[PDB]
């Protein structure tokens, strides 16, 4: 989990990277964006960068898996959010002064160390996201999936298993299960104050 | 799909219903809200009422299934989003002047009339939410589920079947499949202009 | 479990029913077959009637579910095995003196009263056959299925759930689980000595 | 598919492997004319019956070994490694009937998922679902005996491989195979062939 300070740096970094990229058509050097980044940005974790304009979605791309360091993923996601979202036209430079940035940061996935019959009780609906990995098969469902679609812990484990391409009961037979959380930091005004949204799901 | 006019009427109904219930303690009569409602409100469709305060989630409750008329669904969902969301404290009367009201309206679910071999090509990821029905058993998944969790048509059909408590291949064996879409109307400001968000999914 | 006598009566009933049907062309009166029948024959349980000739399958029909009393189930399965097996022509009257009769009797299915956490431990592979029921959905898998296809308790419960048209994890969620056993009684010689085969499965 | 001649050689190989092992407590290979079919990789089961009752049966469903090797191993295990029965004594073989179930080499079904259910024949085909290093198989008698159509069979085999039931719909490889049974009508005597692997359909 990121502190308020780290959360603020996250959005500032996303905003900076985009503005830099919209100007010189090139991404900034990871450690030379003009934002102080604590060592947490070196951790491998997923993230999503959301852009809103006039209260409407303007673009959003992200890394669900911790395939990249937080730093790299923010850079890539932010530039992708403003220029690679096929649902929207590329954002122009002067548009950013009217665009609001949102950064959803996922925690480093940690293996739930329990026995098959204990797993349901260790999976918290509304807080946890899951990754099921067995052999070379891997699958994941974001935290909002379970609460927004009325799934209990047993349901969540089973759907994530099938998401991985495995049998729904794979978790019952010992499939490796990892859990992770998320947090959202967002601009209250362009380049302004940053607020934190604890809930990733709309409804539960 | 609701027109701008109807969408505006929907959000207004949500606000009024909440303000009235918060005022006294008796849910006003749906048609007796003071808000004009076209015949679209007599249609059976699912809905969600979302409240935000200062850019942060303040409450949200809904009924995804089309079991009540739009009018009644909004009514119930609105008061519940404000007083029955176990995630937040009850909304106080004086808080509504600082709250933004959002209303997500789902379309009347329509049966996909295609053989099992053709069903996947009928399901559009990003637009369609699904309902699988078999006898009295029924299950549904919101439109945003597939796009946000990298599921294709086949995955969505299989997952919705399991959500219904049925085998993942139930759709392959002729189980009924219904699809639906949604739209969001939200206040740019309390009791102010209402805009339309056509995207139910954050990312795809 | 049927006794040696009851089992002997089972085969004799099956054999006599056929010899009588083949001759006069009608089914004997259920209680005027010529074989003593204990009260076990009034219990609702499944059974199969097998006919072999010269060491080869000649016919086989049965009732997997306890839809009928043992008596009724045997008369019907016996006549069908001799005259209604689409894999073979109808048996001739002179053929019965060259045919061996086999009868597989299943026990009345009994609900396993255990929590999902206990279910796998209560299901004995190689002995138990399963029936899963949850509402109007019902499915069963014979005792030999699990041991012949290398399935453990967990696998067997999941496969029976899907057989019932339900999600594989239905048992983890509280779906009703019923177990049953079986035994085979067969003629060592035409209308001769009846021996009991305790294993319904070829391998395990 | 094995010829009748080969079918007879398979049961004799099974019977002799057991008598010899039961004699000097170990194994060779023989004295039985074996055609090249015994060098093919295919599953097999060896069954022993005595007095019309099962006396032992062990087998390898998957074609992990050549038929020859699978037969020797299965036969010896059927007589000395089946925990359901006590070990068979030397004197017992003269009163035991030998049965050998030989499965064909699994052949890939080359069709689109839409066509697979049409290619699977209930009653004849057994299935192996393969996706990477994950494999699963269900014997031919499974579908007809438990009232499963093609779709059911494909889905259950996918789960048997530890995969999602809809894996076959998503392109997982499917292989089909058949089997045949050759059995002794008399100890060390005549060998007939049972055409039906399923009890009931």
Swiss-Prot record, chain D:
InterPro entries hit by this protein: AMMECR1, AMMECR1_dom_sf, AMMECR1_domain, AMMECR1_N, AmmeMemoSam_A, Uncharacterised_MJ0810
Disulfide links within the chain: none
Domain AMMECR1 residue range list: 5-193
Highest taxon in the source lineage: Archaea
Alphabetical list of HAMAP family matching this protein: AMMECR1
Identification of the protein by name: Protein MM_0484
């Amino acid at each position: 989990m990121l502190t308020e300070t780290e959360g603020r740096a996250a959005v500032k970094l996303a905003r900076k990277t985009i503005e830099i990229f919209l100007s010189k058509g090139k991404s900034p050097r990871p450690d030379a964006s003009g934002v102080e980044l604590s060592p947490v940005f070196e951790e491998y974790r997923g993230v999503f960068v959301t852009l809103t304009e006039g209260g409407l979605l303007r673009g959003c791309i992200g890394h669900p898996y911790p395939d990249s360091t937080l730093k790299e993923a923010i850079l890539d996601s932010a530039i992708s959010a403003a220029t690679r979202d096929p649902r929207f036209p590329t954002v122009e430079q002067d548009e950013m002064k009217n665009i609001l940035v949102e950064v959803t940061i996922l925690t480093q996935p940690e293996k739930i160390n329990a026995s098959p019959k204990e797993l349901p009780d260790k999976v918290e609906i509304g807080k946890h996201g899951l990754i099921v990995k067995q052999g070379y098969c891997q699958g994941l469902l974001l935290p909002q999936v379970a609460p927004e679609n009325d799934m209990d812990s047993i349901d969540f484990l089973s759907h994530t298993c099938m998401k991985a391409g495995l049998s729904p009961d794979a978790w019952v037979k010992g499939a490796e299960v990892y859990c992770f959380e998320g947090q959202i930091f967002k601009e209250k005004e362009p380049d302004g104050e940053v607020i934190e949204e604890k809930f990733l799901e709309h409804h539960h």
